[PDB]
Amino acid sequence: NLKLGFLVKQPEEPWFQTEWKFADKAGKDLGFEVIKIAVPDGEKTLNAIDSLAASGAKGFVICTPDPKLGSAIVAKARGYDMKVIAVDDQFVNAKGKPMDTVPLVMMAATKIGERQGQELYKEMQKRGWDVKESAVMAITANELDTARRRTTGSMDALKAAGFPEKQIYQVPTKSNDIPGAFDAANSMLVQHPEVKHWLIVGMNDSTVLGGVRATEGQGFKAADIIGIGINGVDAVSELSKAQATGFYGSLLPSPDVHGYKSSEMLYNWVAKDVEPPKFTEVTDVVLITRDNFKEELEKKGLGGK
Ligand SMILES: C[C@H]1O[C@H](O)[C@H](O)[C@@H](O)[C@H]1O
């Protein structure tokens, strides 16, 4: 044999490499081979399905590079008698409305974004920054629902703790990566010279990291910057550095659970026509910082660091 695909939009992120590793484990346990394909754009996405069909795969797990390709992915898979489960990014129709009929495995995005804002606030308090010279830089990808629900949950948590609404600045990024976030943050930074300390809000580690690299390029030292990412496994190189930076820590969800559990449920669907729940929300989360990242990853089975 049974072949299943595991398609991810960004193979460069440790987040997806970890889903790939745990899907392989599910394969070993249940007796199936996992075909690992990178689908960074819509065209590679449709061509990879064709490719899956030529290898005899019976279904695939996918994290789409664009939620709007949902209809087409479903259409091509139905054509090849393949089942599909989405992992992390939900499929939406042309109008941006959720395609509720494709089983989805994903993190509790709002809750994790809210924890990000609660932890930003906490560290800010511990540093004693004066709120009057502080501000939040929120790097958003609003067209991606999962991303939007994390950055909105984070801004909402900050506003709820008392961070002044008018000191929250949003800036859209063109790409969910360091270069995109960098660009975005750099453009906001020169517009606010009055700010002496920044909170950086981003849906994932790469976005917060681009934001931190920009603050360093504008003269901010690490004590005046607080950024907390989301993914965990993606921030290990940052947290491993000799010196501390404005990247304080990351919220470690469960990519191991997403890789193994979406592969297992696919397998059960394809091999026993056992229908997966439509929605699996994983609430797992732990704050990893320079002080505990090695222990927390080893405790989750993601050894090395
Ligand atoms: C949970 C995942 O959500 C999206 O797909 C992000 O782009 C990934 O980096 C990861 O944070």
To test the pocket of ligand 1, the residue of 18, 142, 203, 234 to mutate (highest count of ligand atoms within 8 Å of its CB) is: 203
Tokens matching residue 208? 């917060």
What's the 149 CA to ligand 1 centre distance in angstroms? 12
CATH of domain 108-253+285-305: 3.40.50.2300
Alpha-carbon distance of 55 to 77, in angstroms, equals 14
Q: Which long-range contacts (CB under 8 A, 24 or more apart) does 220-227 make?
A: 220/246, 222/246, 223/127, 224/129, 224/196, 224/197, 224/198, 225/197, 225/198, 225/200, 226/120, 226/123, 226/124, 226/127, 226/197, 226/198, 226/199, 226/200, 227/199, 227/200, 227/202
Atom of ligand 1 nearest to the CA of 231: 11
Sheet of strand 168-172, all strands in order from the earlier edge strand to the far edge: 168-172, 134-140, 197-201, 225-230, 247-252, 286-289
Residue nearest to atom 11 of ligand 1 (CA): 204
CATH of domain 2-107+254-284: 3.40.50.2300
Atom of ligand 1 nearest to the CA of 203: 11
What's the 207 CA to ligand 1 centre distance in angstroms? 10
237 DSSP β-pair partners: none
To test the pocket of ligand 1, the residue of 105, 204, 254 to mutate (highest count of ligand atoms within 8 Å of its CB) is: 204
Alpha-carbon distance of 102 to 106, in angstroms, equals 12
Q: Confirm or reject: Cβ of 231 under 6 Å from ligand 1.
A: yes
47: left (phi over 0), alpha (psi -120 to 50) or beta: alpha
Burial of 53 (0-12, 13-18, 19+ CB in 10 A): middle
Give DSSP secondary structure letters for 60-88.
Answer: EEEE-S-GGGHHHHHHHHHHTT-EEEEES
Alpha-carbon distance of 165 to 152, in angstroms, equals 13
Please check whether the two domains, 2-107+254-284 and 108-253+285-305, share a CATH topology. yes
| Main-chain phi, psi angles of 20, to 5 degrees | -60, -45
Domain edges within the chain = 2-107+254-284, 108-253+285-305
Residue with tokens 């929250």: 168
108 in Cβ contact with 281 (< 8 Å) = yes
Burial of 251 (0-12, 13-18, 19+ CB in 10 A): buried
Could you tell me the CA-to-CA distances from 118 to 37, 92, 122, 195, 285 in Å, in that order?
Answer: 36, 30, 6, 21, 13
* Coil/strand/helix, residue 176: coil
Q: Confirm or reject: Cβ of 16 under 6 Å from ligand 1.
A: no
What's the 204 CA to ligand 1 centre distance in angstroms? 6
